[PDB]
């Protein structure tokens, strides 16, 4: 993640070398900063982004008019930003008959957009704004904003499964973590029509570019794990295989269990898992083999490297074994010196700056969206 300042600075960089992509952005709130952020983020991801911005609140206007500037632009990607905030206003101004059709009408427009067949579409879904008009009782009232929005987000996912060209960017899931209190800045919105806060902007640009990059064929394929204090608490060489911290019951071992469960999901979706550890190989494998509380087993690990050599060399060994790019690899290690040396000595490998407390690893990894993809 970058700051908006860094993203804007990047838009000034020399773009000659980079492959060009034409990106259209159309929204119902003010999009000028988001445009800058997307363009700069793309450049930092090695794309020369030519970004066309529709005029304020002309989404339907541009898409509905075949002679419009939008179609003349012939974009490679079309990013649509329909905000929950503006949909909330739309809903509030109509009677129950039209409110009952809020989701359906929006879904119709989305399908119409998909049917045009114009490059790939990236579409932000809708974080819930609970209006508390009914309280929680809103779930029982079809015409309520809460019901319509829940229906809308569900059917949007079904649209993405029907149209290979249509990608959602999960603004809703992103916002669920940070909260609207952080994502939305009322004072700025009132005076500028900008709906995302300054600190939210780089989060959304990064998540938008993650999708574009994945479609272009740049996505992570492999996760490399340290062992001690990364996937279990403690040091196996000193404490023994029976004594590593993992499993339910109170305390940090539970965090390692839940973290291993995340790794298990990656393996189950085709991510290659490798181990790279400063350990005797026999000792390093023992917990996988003997400790029943391990979630990960040896058969989940494609390449297992445990020795006393520097991890940079070991990662080259792993890369050569797998024949995938260093830039398709993620390396997780609790030791800052190990992280820093892999960063310096194996450029291309992504090395997340894990927080010191293992109880915070997973929520931190969530902020990085490491495993965006574009195929099942």
Closest to 225 in 3D by CA, of 279, 150, 149: 279
Tell me phi and psi for residue 307, to 5 degrees: -160, -170
Q: How far is the CB of 338 from Mg ion (least distance, A)?
A: 7
Distance CA 111, CA 281 (A): 55
Phi-psi region of 163 (alpha: psi -120 to 50; beta: other; left: phi over 0): beta
Q: Which is nearer to Mg ion, 26 or 227 (CB)?
A: 227
By CB under 5 A, name the one of 226, 276, 351, 354 that touches Mg ion: 226
Give strand pairing partners of 24. 52, 78
228 labelled ligand-binding: yes
Number of residues that bind Mg ion (CB under 5 A): 8
Q: How far is the CB of 349 from Mg ion (least distance, A)?
A: 17
Which whole-number Å values give the CA distances from 113 to 68, 78, 178, 291, in the listed order?
Answer: 14, 10, 30, 53
Q: How far is the CB of 193 from Mg ion (least distance, A)?
A: 48
Answer yes or no whether residue 229 interacts with Mg ion by CB under 5 A.
Answer: yes
Q: How far is the CB of 289 from Mg ion (least distance, A)?
A: 17
Q: Which stretch binds Mg ion (CB under 5 A): 28-36, 154-162, 213-221, 226-234?
A: 226-234
334 labelled ligand-binding: yes
Answer yes or no whether residue 228 interacts with Mg ion by CB under 5 A.
Answer: yes
Distance CA 53, CA 101 (A): 29
Quote the tokens at residue 272.
């290659």
Q: How far is the CB of 308 from Mg ion (least distance, A)?
A: 11
Residues in 331-370 that interact with Mg ion by CB under 5 A = 334-335
Distance CA 256, CA 252 (A): 7
Distance CA 164, CA 187 (A): 39
Answer yes or no whether residue 314 interacts with Mg ion by CB under 5 A.
Answer: no
226 labelled ligand-binding: yes
Which whole-number Å values give the CA distances from 99 to 146, 150, 157, 268, 275, in the listed order?
Answer: 11, 13, 21, 41, 54
- What is the pattern of x (binds Mg ion, CB under 5 A) and - over residues 317-336? -----------------xx-
Q: Which is nearer to Mg ion, 47 or 259 (CB)?
A: 259
Distance CA 169, CA 166 (A): 10
Quote the tokens at residue 317.
């060994």
Residues in 30-89 that interact with Mg ion by CB under 5 A = none
Q: Which is nearer to Mg ion, 54 or 275 (CB)?
A: 275
Distance CA 99, CA 138 (A): 13
For residue 299, the tally of other CB atoms under 10 A from its CB is: 8
By CB under 5 A, name the one of 31, 260, 277, 350 that touches Mg ion: 277
Q: How far is the CB of 131 from Mg ion (least distance, A)?
A: 48
Q: Which is nearer to Mg ion, 102 or 349 (CB)?
A: 349
Q: Which is nearer to Mg ion, 102 or 329 (CB)?
A: 329
Q: In what order do the strands lie in the sheet with 222-225?
A: 303-307, 272-278, 222-225, 329-332
Q: How far is the CB of 125 from Mg ion (least distance, A)?
A: 38
Q: Which residue is nearest to Mg ion (CB)?
A: 228
Q: Which residues bind Mg ion (CB under 5 A)?
A: 226-229, 277-278, 334-335
Known binding positions? 226, 228, 333-334
- The annotation places the binding site for Mg(2+) at 226, 228, 333-334
């Amino acid at each position: 993640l970058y700051t908006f300042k860094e993203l804007k600075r990047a838009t000034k960089q020399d773009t000659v070398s980079l492959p060009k992509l034409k990106v259209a952005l159309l929204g119902d709130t003010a999009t000028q900063l988001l445009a800058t952020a997307i363009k700069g983020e793309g450049i930092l991801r090695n794309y020369n982004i030519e970004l066309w911005e529709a005029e304020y609140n002309q989404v339907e206007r541009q898409i509905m008019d075949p002679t419009s500037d939008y179609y003349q632009f012939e974009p490679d990607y079309t990013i649509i930003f329909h905000s929950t905030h503006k949909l909330l206003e739309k809903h509030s101004l109509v009677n129950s008959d039209l409110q009952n059709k809020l989701a359906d009408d929006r879904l119709d427009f989305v399908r119409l957009l998909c049917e045009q067949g114009i490059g790939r579409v990236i579409y932000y879904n809708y974080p819930e704004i609970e209006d508390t008009i009914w309280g929680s009782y809103a779930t029982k009232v079809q015409s309520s904003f809460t019901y319509q929005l829940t229906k809308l987000n569900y059917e949007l996912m079904n649209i993405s499964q029907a149209y290979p060209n249509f990608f959602i960017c999960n603004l809703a899931g992103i916002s669920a973590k940070y909260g609207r209190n952080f994502m939305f800045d009322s004072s700025v919105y009132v005076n500028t029509e900008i709906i995302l806060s300054l600190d939210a902007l780089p989060i959304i640009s990064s998540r938008t570019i993650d999708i574009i990059a994945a479609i272009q064929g740049k996505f992570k394929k492999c996760l490399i794990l340290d062992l001690d204090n990364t996937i279990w608490g403690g040091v196996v060489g000193d404490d023994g295989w029976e004594n590593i911290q993992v499993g339910h019951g109170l305390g940090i071992g539970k965090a390692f269990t839940e973290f291993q469960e995340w790794v298990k999901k990656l393996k189950n979706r085709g991510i290659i898992i490798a181990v790279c550890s400063k350990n005797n190989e026999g000792k390093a494998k023992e917990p996988f083999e003997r400790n029943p509380e391990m979630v990960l087993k040896l058969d989940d690990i494609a390449v297992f490297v445990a020795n006393w050599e520097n991890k940079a060399d070991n990662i080259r060994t792993i890369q050569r074994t797998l024949n995938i790019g260093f830039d398709s690899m993620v390396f997780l290690d609790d030791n800052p010196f190990e992280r820093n040396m892999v960063r310096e000595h194996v450029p291309g490998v992504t090395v997340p700056e894990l927080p010191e407390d293992p109880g915070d690893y997973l929520e931190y990894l969530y902020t990085l969206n490491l495993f965006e993809t574009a195929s099942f």
